[PDB]
Amino acid sequence: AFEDRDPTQFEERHLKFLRQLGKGNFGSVEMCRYDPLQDNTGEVVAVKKLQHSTEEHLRDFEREIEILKSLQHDNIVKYKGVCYSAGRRNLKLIMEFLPYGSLREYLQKHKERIDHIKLLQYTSQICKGMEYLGTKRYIHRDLATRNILVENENRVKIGDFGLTKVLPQDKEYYKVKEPGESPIFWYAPESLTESKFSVASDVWSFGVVLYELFTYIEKSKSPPAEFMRMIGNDKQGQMIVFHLIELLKNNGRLPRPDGCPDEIYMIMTECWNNNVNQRPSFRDLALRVDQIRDNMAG
Ligand SMILES: c1ccc(CN2CCC(n3cnc4cnc5[nH]ccc5c43)CC2)cc1
């Protein structure tokens, strides 16, 4: 006999690998087919797992599963459950599968069909998704277009939370000392220099996402491609970070993309203020971006 009081627990035997969606360092995301009937009646899902797990990495993963479970918003990827695989001696995270993939590969593939008002719609939704996290005191710490997913032409969702921190009620930022390479060209200056993270540091990285949208993910226009151009293309290793910090702290910034409206470029530069306290909130950005759209609606 069988009684199911928990549909969030996926059975590993009925869960079948199809192709890799994303592969990192200590993690990986797969497209899977789940068939509790095995005649193929079950959902296509997305499954995250650990690779080169530490005991420390598993404790983080359990925390990231908690985070994602705590979130219900039209612009946050849907949690579906967990699978305790390897006969209950392993943990994996099960999520909805969004057919269009990450915003990055979508905008690179369909960059002709996607006009400015459209880029503005996805920008607004990323903002709302982030204002929702801030209501929870969550710090994302990794906004870039590869971590944003496209459910269809008119909706995107924030779709990874592997670095997400939860601020205590007492504090306004999270200092996190961590080993290994960081996405330095998306990082706020205080994040580069003091490992400090906050809603304001996510605001910074948001400005870079907006830049990425307005360059239509063109490789020669990308943040590292344009920063390396300013730092010097020949720089290697620690030297780059030294120069990137010095360039940022003296107000050097990414250029306005070809064809990007000044008012949209201006939003990027407000996001990139060295003064954490002069960065707009995500509520301010969603409101500005929606009024811009509405003034381009009629
Ligand atoms: C290791 C961990 C995370 C990452 C980020 N990386 C994971 C895969 C993710 N992704 C790409 N296409 C997707 C379609 N449906 C999905 N449902 C949930 C995620 C997802 C999709 C994009 C972000 C890369 C490497």
Side-chain angles (χ1 to χ4, degrees), residues 1-39 41-58 60-234 236-298:
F2 184 37
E3 187 199 348
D4 189 353
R5 291 319 263 290
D6 194 1
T8 63
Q9 288 179 62
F10 279 70
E11 295 218 46
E12 88 174 299
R13 77 169 176 159
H14 298 142
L15 195 58
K16 296 72 167 319
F17 172 76
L18 308 177
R19 62 174 298 260
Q20 203 165 220
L21 293 179
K23 205 221 253 276
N25 7 73
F26 302 91
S28 172
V29 182
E30 317 159 346
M31 197 199 172
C32 288
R33 168 81 168 240
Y34 184 66
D35 281 295
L37 295 179
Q38 290 169 326
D39 34 36
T41 207
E43 31 201 359
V44 186
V45 294
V47 181
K48 180 160 191 186
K49 69 198 186 173
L50 297 192
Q51 285 166 187
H52 315 83
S53 165
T54 310
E55 229 73 346
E56 255 289 0
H57 293 111
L58 173 64
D60 302 323
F61 196 28
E62 296 180 277
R63 293 208 257 149
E64 163 187 12
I65 298 171
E66 290 305 333
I67 293 331
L68 192 51
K69 194 175 172 308
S70 70
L71 301 165
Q72 318 188 14
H73 190 280
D74 302 344
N75 309 118
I76 298 293
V77 62
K78 260 203 214 59
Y79 167 80
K80 280 183 157 287
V82 291
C83 176
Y84 304 95
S85 59
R88 223 237 167 279
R89 297 160 311 124
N90 200 187
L91 212 207
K92 303 179 175 189
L93 173 53
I94 313 302
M95 292 181 279
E96 60 180 0
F97 169 71
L98 299 185
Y100 294 100
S102 80
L103 181 53
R104 186 174 191 85
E105 77 184 285
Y106 176 78
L107 185 55
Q108 217 166 0
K109 168 166 192 145
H110 304 98
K111 53 200 164 196
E112 267 63 31
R113 169 227 247 71
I114 295 154
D115 65 26
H116 286 357
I117 305 157
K118 213 72 189 163
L119 294 182
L120 287 189
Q121 169 172 28
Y122 304 156
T123 293
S124 181
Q125 303 166 353
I126 284 159
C127 283
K128 293 162 196 197
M130 291 301 316
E131 149 89 315
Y132 176 52
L133 295 214
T135 231
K136 294 205 172 292
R137 292 184 84 71
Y138 289 177
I139 315 292
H140 188 284
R141 309 176 62 222
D142 199 24
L143 282 176
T145 65
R146 72 170 238 276
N147 293 313
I148 311 309
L149 305 182
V150 176
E151 183 203 347
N152 60 54
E153 210 184 7
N154 317 294
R155 181 173 293 182
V156 299
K157 312 188 164 181
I158 300 173
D160 200 75
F161 297 91
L163 293 184
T164 280
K165 288 303 175 185
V166 176
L167 283 170
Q169 328 80 308
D170 126 294
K171 236 296 184 283
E172 279 313 295
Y173 67 82
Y174 218 117
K175 186 166 163 146
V176 183
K177 271 193 310 163
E178 336 181 89
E181 320 287 348
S182 294
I184 64 194
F185 306 111
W186 270 257
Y187 267 26
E190 73 275 3
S191 297
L192 291 165
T193 62
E194 312 181 87
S195 315
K196 292 177 175 177
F197 299 87
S198 58
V199 161
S201 73
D202 282 346
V203 169
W204 178 287
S205 294
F206 172 72
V208 180
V209 162
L210 186 54
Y211 171 97
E212 297 177 71
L213 290 181
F214 278 85
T215 58
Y216 283 81
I217 340 287
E218 177 167 353
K219 187 192 188 45
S220 45
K221 280 257 167 213
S222 58
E226 295 277 12
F227 277 116
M228 279 310 297
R229 179 191 56 76
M230 310 183 257
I231 285 161
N233 275 321
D234 61 284
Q236 345 131 51
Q238 233 43 53
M239 294 102 72
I240 295 166
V241 191
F242 299 176
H243 283 259
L244 174 64
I245 293 174
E246 193 62 17
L247 173 78
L248 298 176
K249 99 193 181 145
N250 293 295
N251 293 329
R253 295 301 179 254
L254 285 165
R256 186 182 52 92
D258 287 8
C260 181
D262 254 320
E263 66 193 332
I264 312 322
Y265 186 42
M266 186 183 306
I267 293 162
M268 301 174 201
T269 71
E270 288 178 34
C271 288
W272 304 327
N273 203 308
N274 291 336
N275 316 284
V276 167
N277 51 311
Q278 302 185 333
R279 282 186 210 149
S281 63
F282 283 108
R283 187 177 344 107
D284 301 314
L285 298 152
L287 250 3
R288 293 154 66 192
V289 175
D290 285 355
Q291 288 169 28
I292 295 181
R293 296 170 53 206
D294 185 70
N295 290 338
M296 298 181 84

